[PDB]
């Protein structure tokens, strides 16, 4: 009945929302899923607060 939690050192995205039929986080930011896939796996840079 009781559970435990693991404190992740770095934030990690939920695959069920990132990679689904409508790509929830992709739809929210109006960004193509490919760019989000690239930046999420440490490939490319998205420049927040331009």
């Amino acid at each position: 009945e009781r559970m435990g939690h693991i404190e992740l050192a770095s934030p990690t995205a939920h695959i069920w929302f990132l990679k689904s039929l409508p790509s929830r986080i992709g739809l929210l930011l109006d960004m193509p899923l490919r760019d989000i896939e690239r930046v999420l796996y440490f490939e490319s840079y998205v420049v927040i607060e331009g």
Binding site: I6, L8, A9, T12, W16, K19, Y41, F42
Partner: protein
């Protein structure tokens, strides 16, 4: 919830989920160590990638494109795989829960049973109904503790059986087949204790179940609560399910042996022993047949009292001398009062019996219908056993004109081939003409076969011989409707027909040999084509 307790030879290591969790924890710890150690940015980013991949695998393994594995190179079961699919805890453990108080065995006929009961092996019942036995043993004072009652049960003492005969009196059980498509699949039944090892099923209810006796297996569940026992009596008992939910047609229909017995019972012979006698009543008809002074089917004159319910709730008696056979007069006793006499004066095939049952259900209530069905089944079984209806090689009569028809058809085929050679007709035209003439030959062969089987018997009617409906066993099994249509009779005496090629093209040369005679190698191959096609179609028809 993640067990890791196989305990086989001390292995103590079977958790797919636990491995993934350890992977995630190890990656997180290494990332923390690198972060506090101020490692180069590239190494920290690589460890971050590893952590993200581990979390992805933990949540839904195989969604990114790769699958974490290693156990004989088989993908690991993540949390997402434990919810979806046909094996997750949503269609395997939440909808279709396995139940206790259940059993399983093979089926057997047991015609002695009534409609509302069924057989149940003693050794199966003594384990299905163990808690009730414990309770009644404690109540009657035979045992004191649950351990003493347990020992008394395992010893299988004589008192235990007497107790079991009390907790089984009015305790319905839910016999259930495996592919229960419609609601009639699981039906309630009162238990009748037998000494075998198979649950006996009433022959009439072997149609609603789609039940079969080639080794089919059923499951026996036991209702426990008072509401369950009342419901498995007022909602699911076999007596209350007469009409199918989809179409308003009876679901208890005499299928094979009883219909043959009734057909053999209710026929006529142009000259049999005991013809023209004026019988007193059905009792006298039964006495005369049993003694042997007369035969089952012989036209006589017997007075019969027909009760009609034309008056509202009043049964008016009409006694008259109706002209009918001995066999029909004997069957009149089974028929209840309300129904008229014209129902049991015909040949009484299969549709006739179904219509008789339906008319009984309409005019009378449901209560007499069950008894009528049971009596019909008993009488049909008895007078089918007395008949000795058997199939022999001499019964399959080959029409005499078959060789002439085949020779003429071959002559027509040769003529069409000659026209094709001369260029008068094309290849497709030749093919179509050959198919048409072979089909015509097949029709003629089938017609000749039927004409030589349906009315072949000629019997001496106290003088010049008179044609009569034949008594051929194959014809009796086909006309009544017991088992086998006209096409299957054709395949046994007439030509098989034009068999088809796998793609669908009809082969020019038809199988001109019946099953009674020899079948050539090529003809058997052509038949194998269609047989394999049919079996393969059914194999996936089921799943679809």
């Amino acid at each position: 919830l993640r067990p890791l307790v196989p305990l086989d030879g001390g292995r103590f290591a079977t958790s797919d989920l636990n491995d993934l969790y350890r992977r995630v924890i190890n990656r997180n710890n290494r990332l923390k160590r690198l972060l506090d150690l101020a490692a180069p940015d590239i190494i920290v980013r690589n460890e971050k990638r590893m952590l993200q991949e581990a979390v992805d695998a933990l949540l839904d393994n195989g969604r990114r494109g790769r699958a974490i594995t290693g156990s004989n190179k088989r993908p690991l079961k993540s949390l997402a795989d434990m919810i979806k699919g046909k094996q997750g805890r949503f269609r395997q453990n939440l909808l279709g829960k396995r139940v206790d108080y259940s059993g399983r065995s093979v089926i057997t006929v047991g015609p002695y049973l009534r409609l509302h009961q069924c057989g149940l092996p003693k050794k199966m019942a003594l384990e299905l109904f163990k808690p009730f036995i414990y309770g009644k043993l404690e109540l009657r004072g035979l045992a004191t503790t649950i351990k003493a009652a347990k020992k008394m049960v395992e010893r299988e003492e004589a008192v235990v059986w007497d107790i079991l005969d009390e907790v089984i009196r009015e305790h319905p059980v839910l016999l259930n087949r495996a592919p229960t498509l419609h609601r009639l699949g699981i039906q309630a039944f009162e238990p009748v204790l037998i000494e075998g090892k198979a649950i006996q099923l009433h022959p009439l209810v072997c149609a609603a179940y789609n039940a079969d006796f080639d080794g089919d297996q059923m499951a026996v569940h036991v209702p426990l609560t008072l509401e369950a026992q009342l419901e498995a009596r007022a909602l699911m008992m076999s007596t209350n399910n007469i009409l199918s939910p989809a179409n308003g047609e009876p679901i208890i229909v005499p299928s094979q042996d009883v219909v043959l017995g009734l057909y053999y019972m209710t026929r006529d012979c142009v000259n049999a022993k005991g013809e023209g006698m004026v019988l007193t009543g059905p009792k006298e008809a039964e006495r005369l047949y049993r003694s042997g002074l007369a035969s089952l089917h012989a036209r006589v004159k017997v007075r019969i009292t027909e009760y009609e319910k034309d008056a509202n709730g009043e049964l008016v008696a009409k006694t008259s001398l109706k002209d009918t056979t001995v066999g029909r007069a004997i069957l009149w006793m089974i028929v209840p009062k309300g129904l008229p006499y014209s129902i049991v004066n015909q040949a009484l095939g299969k549709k006739a019996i179904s219509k008789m049952l339906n008319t009984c259900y309409r005019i009378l209530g449901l209560k007499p219908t069950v008894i009528f069905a049971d009596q019909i089944m008993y009488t049909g079984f008895a007078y089918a056993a007395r008949s000795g209806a058997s199939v022999g090689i001499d019964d399959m009569v080959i029409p005499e004109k078959k060789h002439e028809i085949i020779s003429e058809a071959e002559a027509e085929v040769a003529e069409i081939q000659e026209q094709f050679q001369s260029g008068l007709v094309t290849a497709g035209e030749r093919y179509n003409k050959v198919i048409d003439i072979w089909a015509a030959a097949n029709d003629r062969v089938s017609k000749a076969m039927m004409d030589n089987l349906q009315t072949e018997t000629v019997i001496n009617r106290d003088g010049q011989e008179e044609k009569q409906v034949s008594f051929n066993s194959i014809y009796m099994m086909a006309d009544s409707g017991a088992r086998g249509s006209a096409a299957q009779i054709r395949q046994l005496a007439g030509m098989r027909g034009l068999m088809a090629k796998p793609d669908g093209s009809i082969i020019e040369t038809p199988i001109t040999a019946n099953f009674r005679e020899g079948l050539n190698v090529l003809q058997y191959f052509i038949s194998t084509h269609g047989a394999r096609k049919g079996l393969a179609d059914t194999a996936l028809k089921t799943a679809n």
